[PDB]
Design a protein around this ligand. Structure first.
Ligand SMILES: O=C(Cc1cccc(F)c1)Nc1cncc2ccccc12
Ligand SMILES: O=C(Cc1cccc(F)c1)Nc1cncc2ccccc12
Ligand SMILES: [Cl-]
Lengths: 305, 305
């Protein structure tokens, strides 16, 4: 019993964090095998940030301009290349702590653990979701660039995010580990704003099923809804549209609790209309949207209470 | 920017988790140096749990009755002893991954990271607080016994909790690493209940300072209060008393934000009497009490380990 915002154990990622310095700029790098991955903006000055020509800034650098520190050991850079917005520094030592890993690009609504780092040293671990507007509501200070987001299903680390920047609203933008940004963002100091964010509907439904599994049913009602009527109501509360894919994905949770997906949608519609009336659901007075259907099945018991 | 419920990096603890099996019961153990620590109820059958005589159950066991598995390696138990509610299994191999550590007993209100484990394998990490009623609102399923709670101070892991049981309300009870329970609990299958809980006042104040640091100031007001008038109001809402020690500990946050502790107390008093009026603070419609003043400073400064 209980339901917490739970991150993956960070040990496998901690053994990959290094410090990358280029001139006066220091940030984090991810050392996997003989390659250190980091944001390409480590080569920029604050001036270079408005309209940086990364190809031009990079061609002026040699391997010895990049200082890589793994604990108290200086790694030797023997090559460098840019792939999209990530800089790949080839080093002369393979990381002996390299876990089984993959690079995965995630979709909005997906969750992941973030290991926040400063100077190549891990500071904390927290759970995030990729918002529908492609930002993440992280907790990052200056020096956190290069910190990564990941999932660890089995003993394989799936790296899905590398931190690059903080937008003016305090939310964060970054790339996958191939250097492709999530969203329309650029690694430039030019005016950029996060689009209007919406609630991850499929995740709220998953979390309502987590509440039913843990013993709570106060929010259920005798009604059902069509998928289209649900979406018409949901969009008025800035909720993402629920697709047939989402309905299918919620199948297992629906079968375990005995509550049809469209019946849970009816409960959600009523919660949006009424609020909670002084009640909580899994210790929360707001509808939680940073647990996916997969997270709920992983955390909750296979036996409903 | 941003403020998340953040756990310590769990890597140093992950390298200590082992599986302990005694008969049909499998749970988790903490392997530090040549000793594996685990709940003493691992030696009990379901019938024994009704009224156990642990000295009598233990004297019937030999070293070879305890199977300890560290990854895919079977450790050989060369001795066994009980200290309060923890069983200490002496093994022939010192854990090469033993970090710098201490066993510390925490006070209610103090926070710690929990590395939830099943079959000696870490599954997730989350942050929680020792409630004033000595329970923890964890997320634990069957097989999670022996999972530990910890903090990190510099490079030293301070182990403060070992999981033993779940109470009927879904909340959790355990011991320090010396086997002393937090709370008036016993490791026996008998009628036990969590007492009425209260809110950790100093922690709510710390979280209000975190909100102010993060640009959420709508709740600030021109008013101040005396410590005694605040405590009279706080007692009415099932909030823990605020002591002069709590006022002192929040001093740095009072100085950084310019809001005196008693000035923040008058904001809290107004929130208790009037609610949030449809507003949120750091994305929450409830007053959060699982961040200590130290947690707020650490996260709002980027301390690494
Ligand atoms: O945003 C940047 C640098 C930057 C600027 C423009 C484009 C970039 F790609 C990168 N750094 C930070 C990242 N995360 C959190 C921060 C918090 C405070 C101050 C800086 C923070
Ligand atoms: O509570 C116990 C066993 C127990 C029983 C009586 C006294 C004890 F000291 C220990 N184990 C569990 C721990 N956490 C979560 C659980 C969830 C479901 C089922 C068991 C769970
Ligand atoms: Cl995805």
């Amino acid at each position: 019993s209980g339901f917490r915002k739970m991150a993956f154990p960070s040990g496998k990622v901690e053994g990959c964090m290094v410090q990358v310095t280029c001139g006066t700029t220091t940030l984090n790098g991810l050392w996997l095998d003989d390659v250190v991955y980091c944001p390409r903006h480590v080569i920029c000055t604050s001036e270079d940030m408005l309209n940086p020509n990364y190809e031009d800034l990079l061609i002026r650098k040699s391997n010895h301009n990049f200082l890589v520190q793994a604990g108290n050991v200086q790694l030797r850079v023997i090559g460098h290349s840019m792939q999209n917005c990530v800089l790949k520094l080839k080093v002369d030592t393979a990381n002996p702590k390299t876990p089984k890993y993959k690079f995965v690009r995630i979709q909005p609504g997906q969750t992941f653990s973030v290991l926040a780092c400063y100077n190549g040293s891990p500071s904390g671990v927290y759970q995030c979701a990729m918002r529908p507007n492609f930002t993440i509501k992280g907790s990052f200070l200056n020096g956190s660039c290069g910190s990564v987001g990941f999932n660890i299903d089995y003993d394989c680390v799936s790296f899905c995010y590398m931190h690059h920047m903080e937008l003016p609203t305090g939310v964060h933008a970054g790339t996958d580990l191939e250097g492709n940004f999530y969203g329309p963002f650029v690694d430039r100091q030019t005016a950029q704003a996060a689009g209007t964010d919406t609630t991850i509907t499929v995740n709220v439904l998953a979390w309502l099923y987590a509440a039913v599994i843990n013993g709570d049913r106060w929010f259920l009602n005798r009604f059902t809804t069509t998928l289209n009527d649900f979406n018409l109501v949901a969009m008025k509360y800035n909720y993402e549209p629920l697709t047939q894919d989402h309905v299918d994905i919620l199948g297992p949770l629906s079968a375990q609790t005995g509550i049809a997906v469209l019946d849970m949608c009816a409960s959600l519609k009523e919660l949006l209309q009424n609020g909670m009336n002084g009640r909580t659901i899994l210790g929360s007075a707001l509808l939680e949207d940073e647990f996916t259907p997969f997270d709920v099945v992983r955390q909750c018991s296979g036996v409903t209470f």
